[PDB]
Design a protein around this ligand. Structure first.
Ligand code: MER
Length: 242
C-alpha cells in the first residue's frame, strides 16, 4: 500500500541525491516516506521553522500585533529581500531573521524558555542566548515532533488563544491550487554540521480536510532552495493528498 507510494517517494529523494524524510499525519495516523526514514525521529535545529512558535508566543503575550511595521533602519542584511520595512506576516514569508530576533528580544529569554517548556517543543532547551538558540542549538526538534506541532496549529489545538492561532495560520499560506490550500514554513540551516532543510505545514483539501506534513532533508549549498518544494509537491501529488 504505502510501500508502493514509498518506493516512488524513496526514488524521488534518490533522484536528487539527498537523504530526506517526509512525515505525513492525517489526524492521529503518522506515515513515513523518503529514503532516510531514521531522520523522522532524529533531532535537528528547527532554524527558521521556529518563527511559527516565535510569532505565537509574541502575539499571545502582546509584544506585537499583525499590523505593526518593523522598520529596516538601513543596515545590510544576509539577504537583500529582507532589506525593507515589514510586518510579522511578511517576515514569516521571507524568513526575515532580524524582525523575529527583535520579537524574541521583546519576549525575553525567560518568557521564551517558559513558553517553549509549556508547549513542549522538541527538547525544549533554549539556553542563555536569546537570539540564536533555534539556529545553532541547544534547541532541537524531530520531524515527527514538527508535524505534530503544525497539525495542532492547523486544528487550532495548540495552547494559545484561538485568534492568535488564526493569525499565525494566515501568515503561512504558501500556495493555493485547484481548491487545495498549502500552508507551510521553510527553513534552511546553512552554517551547521550537515546542513538541514525543513518544510513543515499542512494541506487544507477542498472539503476542509487537513493533512499535515514535515519534510526534513540534508541540504548542500549547490541545491536550489526550491528542491524542498519540489520534493514536497511531487510526493503529495503521488500520495493523492493534492
Ligand atoms: C531559516 O531556516 C533561514 C532562512 N530560511 C530560508 C529558506 O528556508 O530558504 C532563507 S530565507 C531567504 C533566503 N532565500 C529567500 C527565500 O525566502 N527562499 C528561498 C524561500 C529569502 C534563510 C536561510 C534563516 C535562519 O536564515
Amino acid at each position: 500500500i504505502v510501500q508502493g507510494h514509498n518506493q516512488v517517494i524513496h526514488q524521488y529523494f534518490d533522484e536528487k541525491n539527498t537523504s530526506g524524510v517526509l512525515v505525513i499525519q492525517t489526524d492521529k495516523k503518522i506515515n513515513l516516506y523518503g529514503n532516510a526514514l531514521s531522520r523522522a525521529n532524529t533531532e535537528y535545529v528547527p532554524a527558521s521553522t521556529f518563527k511559527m512558535l516565535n510569532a505565537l508566543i509574541g502575539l499571545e503575550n502582546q509584544k506585537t500585533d499583525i499590523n505593526e511595521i518593523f522598520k529596516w533602519k538601513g543596515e545590510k542584511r544576509s539577504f537583500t529581500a529582507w532589506e525593507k520595512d515589514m510586518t510579522l506576516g511578511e517576515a514569516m514569508k521571507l524568513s526575515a531573521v532580524p524582525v523575529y530576533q527583535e520579537l524574541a528580544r521583546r519576549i525575553g529569554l525567560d518568557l521564551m524558555q517558559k513558553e517553549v517548556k509549556r508547549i513542549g517543543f522538541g527538547n525544549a532547551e533554549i539556553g542563555q542566548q536569546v537570539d540564536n538558540f533555534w539556529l545553532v542549538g541547544p534547541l532541537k526538534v524531530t520531524p515527527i515532533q514538527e508535524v505534530e506541532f503544525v497539525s495542532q496549529l492547523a486544528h487550532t489545538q495548540l495552547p494559545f488563544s484561538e485568534k492568535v492561532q488564526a493569525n499565525v495560520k494566515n501568515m503561512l499560506l504558501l500556495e493555493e491550487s485547484n481548491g487545495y490550500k498549502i500552508f507551510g514554513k521553510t527553513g534552511w540551516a546553512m552554517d551547521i554540521k550537515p546542513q538541514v532543510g525543513w518544510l513543515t505545514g499542512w494541506v487544507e483539501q477542498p472539503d476542509g480536510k487537513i493533512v499535515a506534513f514535515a519534510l526534513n532533508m540534508e541540504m548542500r549549498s549547490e541545491m536550489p532552495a526550491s528542491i524542498r518544494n519540489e520534493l514536497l509537491m511531487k510526493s503529495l501529488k503521488q500520495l493523492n493528498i493534492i
